[PDB]
Design a protein around this ligand. Structure first.
Ligand SMILES: OC[C@H]1O[C@H](O[C@H]2[C@H](O)[C@@H](O)[C@@H](O)O[C@@H]2CO)[C@H](O)[C@@H](O)[C@@H]1O
Length: 369
């Protein structure tokens, strides 16, 4: 079903799909080959469906945690670029895209969450989570909440959990110990506990998705949020005054957000295996190609060494790096498919209050399998 001769590209609707579209015309200009850009839903789950029955895109863009899962199922393209090309990118980004001594994806960007605040409505930041229960009331004397952020997803709620020692899989002898999961440890339980007890005093709401958080800030209904560099485009153009800084201290310990790497590979069935390699190596990963993508919807700390240290200036990005290096990198193994949903469940359950904090989690230890 994958057609012989052309390119179709898959990337999420929060990154730059209008920036990556403009890059397509320079590729259509020289070689004459067609390059369509797309942004479907549940593409983390749609890809290993369409690929597992001989379909799907030429190229897919996502955090590196799924690609080891796609390398297991056997629906990827093993990339073999020259080592001189691997010398142009920060070496550690390849240690993400290497499941079992062999290559499967190019790295493009380095992601991490960072505290954004409404400099206008709230001048200085809180440095513990602990003071937000007092911070809420003062702004709630003007119809405005302290913090709001997507609670439904685990990516945003994990930073707070990890702080006090909350871990997916224990780091035992190079590889990851699957058999010791740590979502239901004493530190993690108390982390989640604080997210729930924030909500129980109406200082956040339980069912606040992504769209509500963004909009609420981007106009001004609330004075804080937790989001990536990708949301700086809409904030800038919605004309808000905002700094970026550290993700603050749960129990005098730093939030450890899971550090993703926006990476890309090619389909197993695909007949255009060297067509994407000429597109990837030459056009996109450049100080012209990564510019127009960063223009539309920022990536922050890019993987190509040359363009990264040209835009390392912005205190926003530096602060994004500060969180990132203080947090830890996402593991790549297959069960990271299952790990994310185990918590995704357990969070919402206790978040609203449907279940006890301890039961939802001590269940979710089982779910990671
Ligand atoms: O922790 C899992 C949770 O976060 C990540 O999703 C991120 C993704 O990493 C970013 O590149 C961007 O797309 O924002 C996403 C959240 O909306 C995980 O990759 C994914 O399992 C899940 O969303």
């Amino acid at each position: 079903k994958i057609e012989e001769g052309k390119l179709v590209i898959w990337i999420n609707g929060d990154k730059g799909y209008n920036g990556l579209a403009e890059v397509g015309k320079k590729f259509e200009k020289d070689t004459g080959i067609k390059v369509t850009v797309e942004h479907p839903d549940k593409l983390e789950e749609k890809f290993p469906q369409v690929a597992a029955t001989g379909d799907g895109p030429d190229i897919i863009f996502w955090a590196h945690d799924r690609f080891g899962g796609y390398a297991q199922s056997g629906l990827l393209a093993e990339i073999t670029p020259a080592a001189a090309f691997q010398d142009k990118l920060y070496p550690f980004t390849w240690d993400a895209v290497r499941y079992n001594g062999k290559l499967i994806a190019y790295p493009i960007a380095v992601e991490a969450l960072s505290l954004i605040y409404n400099k206008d409505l709230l001048p200085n930041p809180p440095k513990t989570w602990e003071e937000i229960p007092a911070l809420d009331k003062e702004l709630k004397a003007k119809g405005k909440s302290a913090l709001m952020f997507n609670l439904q997803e685990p990516y945003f709620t994990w930073p707070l959990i990890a702080a006090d020692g909350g871990y997916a899989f224990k780091y035992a002898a190079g590889k990851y110990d699957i058999k010791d999961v740590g979502v239901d440890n004493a530190g993690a339980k108390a982390g989640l506990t604080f997210l729930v007890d924030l909500i129980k005093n109406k200082h956040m709401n339980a069912d606040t998705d992504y769209s509500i958080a963004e909009a609420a800030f981007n106009k001004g209904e609330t004075a804080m949020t937790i989001n990536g560099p990708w949301a700086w485009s809409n904030i800038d153009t919605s004309a808000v005054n905002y700094g970026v800084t550290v993700l603050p201290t749960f129990k005098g310990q730093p939030s450890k957000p899971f550090v993703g790497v926006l990476s890309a590979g090619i389909n197993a069935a695909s007949p255009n295996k060297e067509l994407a390699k000429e597109f990837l190596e030459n056009y996109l990963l450049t100080d012209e190609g990564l510019e127009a993508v960063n223009k539309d919807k920022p990536l922050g700390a890019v993987a190509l060494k040359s363009y990264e240290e040209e835009l390392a200036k912005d205190p926003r990005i530096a602060a994004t790096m500060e969180n990132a290096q203080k947090g830890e990198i996402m593991p790549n193994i297959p069960q990271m498919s299952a790990f994310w949903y185990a918590v995704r469940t357990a969070v919402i359950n206790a978040a609203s209050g449907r279940q006890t904090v301890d039961a939802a989690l001590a269940a979710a230890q089982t779910n990671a399998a």
